[PDB]
Swiss-Prot record:
It is found in: Nucleus; Chromosome. Chromatin reader protein that specifically recognizes and binds histone H4 acetylated at 'Lys-5' and 'Lys-12' (H4K5ac and H4K12ac, respectively), thereby controlling gene expression and remodeling chromatin structures. Recruits transcription factors and coactivators to target gene sites, and activates RNA polymerase II machinery for transcriptional elongation. This is Bromodomain-containing protein 2. The lineage of its organism: Eukaryota, Metazoa, Chordata, Craniata, Vertebrata. The chain holds residues 344 to 455 of 801 of the full protein. Some specific inhibitors of BRD2 that prevent binding to acetylated histone are promising therapeutic molecules for the treatment of cancers or inflammatory diseases. ABBV-744, a small molecule, has been tested on tumors with success: ABBV-744 antiproliferative activity is mainly restricted to cell lines of acute myeloid leukaemia and prostate cancer and is able to displace BRD4 from chromatin. GSK046 (iBET-BD2), which specifically inhibits the second bromo domain, is a promising therapeutic small molecule for the treatment of inflammatory and autoimmune diseases. The gene is BRD2.
Length: 112
């Protein structure tokens, strides 16, 4: 009921993060990191729990998320992975911060 409503809120946020409006900074987070393709051969030694928006979308579509907290923990994990792997002055870190600002301000408007 109110839980369903909280998950619709989460799905709305997800759709927004995937939307054209935010694509300039959201695009690195759309799909799983392909470490080989990027020559980032240390990625999976540093990042033990990869996460990306397509995975979040699959989990939402499959009704994997049972509550908003579970959903938010994955979205936040995605940002954390970026903050852990990359130096803090890299462009992709700025992009992550901007996308997380979008996430956090809308997530905060949680139906209650
Ligand atoms: C994973 C390796 C990291 C990188 O490329 O270091 C070699 C990478 N940087 C980037 C990255 C680097 C520079 C810019 Cl301007 C944007 C993204 C990256 C690029 C992608 O292109 C498909 C997908 C994922 C990432 N990404 C995320 C998310 N977190 N770190 C990265
Ligand atoms: Ni959390």
């Amino acid at each position: 009921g109110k839980l369903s409503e909280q998950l619709k809120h989460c799905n709305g946020i997800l759709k927004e993060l995937l939307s054209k409006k935010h694509a300039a900074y959201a695009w690195p987070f759309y799909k799983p990191v392909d470490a080989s393709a990027l020559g980032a051969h240390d990625y999976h030694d540093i990042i033990k729990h990869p996460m990306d928006l397509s995975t979040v979308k699959r989990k939402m579509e499959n009704r994997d998320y049972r509550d908003a907290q579970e959903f938010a923990a994955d979205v936040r994990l995605m940002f954390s992975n970026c903050y852990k792997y990359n130096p803090p002055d890299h462009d992709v870190v700025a992009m992550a911060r901007k996308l997380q600002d979008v996430f956090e301000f809308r997530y905060a408007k949680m139906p209650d």
